[PDB]
Every structure is written in C-alpha cells, then in structure tokens.
C-alpha cells in the first residue's frame, strides 16, 4: 500500500505535466481516479519518471 | 504482488497522523514499567486471593 496525499498529487502534476495530461483525458472520461493511479503505478511511465 | 493506493484530499491525513500517534502511544504502553517495579510494594498489603 502507498499513501497518496493531495499535495503529493499536486506535486506529481506540477513536476510531471505528462501525468496531469494523462489525468485530464482519462479520469472524467474512461475510468475513475483511484483506478487511474492504480494503473499508473503499475506502468512503465512511472518507472521511467522515477 | 498487487498494488493498492490511498487517495486523500489532505483532510483525513491529519486523522491518519493522529492514528499513528495513537499507535505510538500503544507502543509506549507496551514498554511501560510494571507498578511493582517502579515503586516499592512493602507498605501495601500482602498478595493473595
């Protein structure tokens, strides 16, 4: 398990605009936000950005 | 294996910190010295039924 603070989400968006860009076109459109972050932490994009 | 997340709007996180403080208090209570060790038991009554 990982704790995701709101300011952690804001700093993820600010430091990485790619995550906010993927957030804007998916979360209100296809799947909800916790599903989005569950998909993102299992993705190669997270490993590349880390 | 599986990944789980804790999405918070930074409002319940203060409550989570308070719960961690409660866990720390429980840790303090676990290592508490017994009352028969921190002070003498001579003046008190003898043990029994």
């Amino acid at each position: 398990n990982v704790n995701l603070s709101r300011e952690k989400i804001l700093n993820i968006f600010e430091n990485y605009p790619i995550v906010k860009k993927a957030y804007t076109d998916n979360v209100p459109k296809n799947f909800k936000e916790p599903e989005f972050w569950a998909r993102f932490f299992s993705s190669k994009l997270f490993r590349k950005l880390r | 294996a599986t990944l789980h997340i804790n999405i918070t709007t930074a409002s319940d996180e203060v409550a989570q910190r308070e719960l961690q403080e409660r866990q720390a208090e429980e840790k303090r209570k676990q290592n508490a010295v017994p009352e028969w060790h921190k002070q003498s038991t001579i003046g008190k009554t003898a043990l029994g039924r």
């Binding site: 799947f31 909800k32 916790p34 599903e35 569950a38 998909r39 299992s42 | 294996a1 599986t2 990944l3 789980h4 997340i5 999405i7």
Partner: peptide, 22 residues
C-alpha cells in the same frame, strides 16, 4: 490470465471501495 485478472479485479475492488467511502 490470473495476474492480468487479479490486477484488474483489484483495481475494480479499490474503485468500488473508494466510491462507497465517498
């Protein structure tokens, strides 16, 4: 199949829990 299905049902369970809590 079981890792893919386990990942997607874990995601759906997390989504259901977080919609229930909100």
């Amino acid at each position: 199949i079981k890792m893919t299905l386990q990942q997607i049902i874990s995601r759906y369970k997390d989504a259901d829990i977080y919609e229930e809590k909100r």
